[PDB]
Amino acid sequence: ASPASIIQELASAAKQYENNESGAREALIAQSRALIASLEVPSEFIQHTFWSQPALSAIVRLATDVNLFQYLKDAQEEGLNAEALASKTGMDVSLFARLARHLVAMNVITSRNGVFYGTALSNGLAAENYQQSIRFCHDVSRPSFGAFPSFFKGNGYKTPALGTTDGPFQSAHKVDISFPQWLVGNPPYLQYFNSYMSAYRAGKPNWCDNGFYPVADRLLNGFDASVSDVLLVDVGGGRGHDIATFGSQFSPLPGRLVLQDREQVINSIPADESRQFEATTHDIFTTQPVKHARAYYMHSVPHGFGDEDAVKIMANLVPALAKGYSRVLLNEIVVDEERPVMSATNMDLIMLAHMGAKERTEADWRSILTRAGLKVVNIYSYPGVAESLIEAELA
Ligand X SMILES: CC(C)=CCC/C(C)=C/CC/C(C)=C/Cc1c(O)c(C)c2c(c1O)C(=O)OC2
Q: Which amino acid is at 346?
A: N
Q: Which backbone phi and psi does 275 adopt, to 5 degrees? A: -55, 140
Closer residue to a second copy, CB minimum distance, 114 or 211: 114
Is 364 known to sit in a ligand binding site?
no
Is 264 known to sit in a ligand binding site?
yes
What is the contact surface with ligand SAH in residues (CB under 6 A)? 180, 197, 236-238, 241-242, 261-262, 265, 283-285, 299-301
Is 242 known to sit in a ligand binding site?
yes
| Minimum gap (Å) between residue 173 Cβ and ligand SAH | 18
Q: How is 286-336 classified by DSSP, letter by letter?
A: S---S-S-SEEEEESSGGGS-HHHHHHHHHTTGGGPPTTT-EEEEEE-EE-
In this structure, the strands spanning 327-332 and 388-394 are antiparallel
Give residues 208-247 in contact with a second copy (rule: CB under 8 A): none
265 touches ligand X (CB under 6 A) = yes
- 3-state SS assignment for residue 81: strand
CA 186/CA 211 separation, integer angstroms: 41
Sorted by sequence, the CB contacts under 8 Å of residue 340 that are 6+ apart come out as none
Q: Which amino acid is at 56?
A: L
Rg of the chain on CA atoms, in Å: 23
Is 236 known to sit in a ligand binding site?
yes
What is the per-residue burial (b if ≥16 Cβ within 10 Å, else e) of 244-275? bebbeebeebebbbbbbbbeebbeebeeeeeb
Closer residue to ligand X, CB minimum distance, 215 or 265: 265
Phi/psi-derived region of residue 186, left when phi > 0, alpha when psi is between -120 and 50, beta in every other case: beta
CA 316/CA 289 separation, integer angstroms: 9
Quick one: which of 12, 141, 245, 276 contacts ligand X (CB under 6 A)? 141
Q: Please tell me which residue in 282, 332, 354, 387 is annotated as part of the active site.
A: 332
| Minimum gap (Å) between residue 244 Cβ and ligand SAH | 11
Q: Please tell me which residue in 359, 362, 391, 393 is annotated as part of the active site.
A: 359
* Residue 303 designated active-site: yes
174 touches a second copy (CB under 8 A) = no
Is 272 known to sit in a ligand binding site?
no
| Minimum gap (Å) between residue 132 Cβ and a second copy | 11
Give residues 135-154 in contact with a second copy (rule: CB under 8 A): 137-138, 141-143, 145-149, 152-153
Tell me the site size for ligand X, rule CB under 6 A: 17
CA 259/CA 332 separation, integer angstroms: 18
| Minimum gap (Å) between residue 356 Cβ and ligand X | 10
Is 283 known to sit in a ligand binding site?
yes
Q: How is 158-200 classified by DSSP, letter by letter?
A: ---SSSSSSSHHHHHTT-SS-HHHHHHHSTTHHHHHHHHHTTT
Break positions in the chain: residue before each gap, C to N over 2.5 angstroms = none
283 binds, options a second copy, ligand X, ligand SAH, none, Cβ within 5 to 8 A by partner type = ligand SAH
Quick one: which of 354, 358, 360, 366 contacts ligand X (CB under 6 A)? 354
| Minimum gap (Å) between residue 266 Cβ and a second copy | 24
Q: Which backbone phi and psi does 353 adopt, to 5 degrees? A: -75, -25
The site map against ligand X for 243-262 (x = CB under 6 A) is: -------------------x
* Residue 332 designated active-site: yes
Quick one: which of 51, 211, 249, 308 contacts a second copy (CB under 8 A)? 51
Tell me the site size for a second copy, rule CB under 8 A: 109
Is 200 known to sit in a ligand binding site?
yes
CA 333/CA 225 separation, integer angstroms: 32
274 touches a second copy (CB under 8 A) = no
Q: What residue ranges bind ligand X (CB under 6 A)?
A: 141, 180, 183-184, 190, 193, 197, 200, 262, 264-265, 300-301, 304, 350, 354-355
Residues identified as active-site: 303, 332, 359
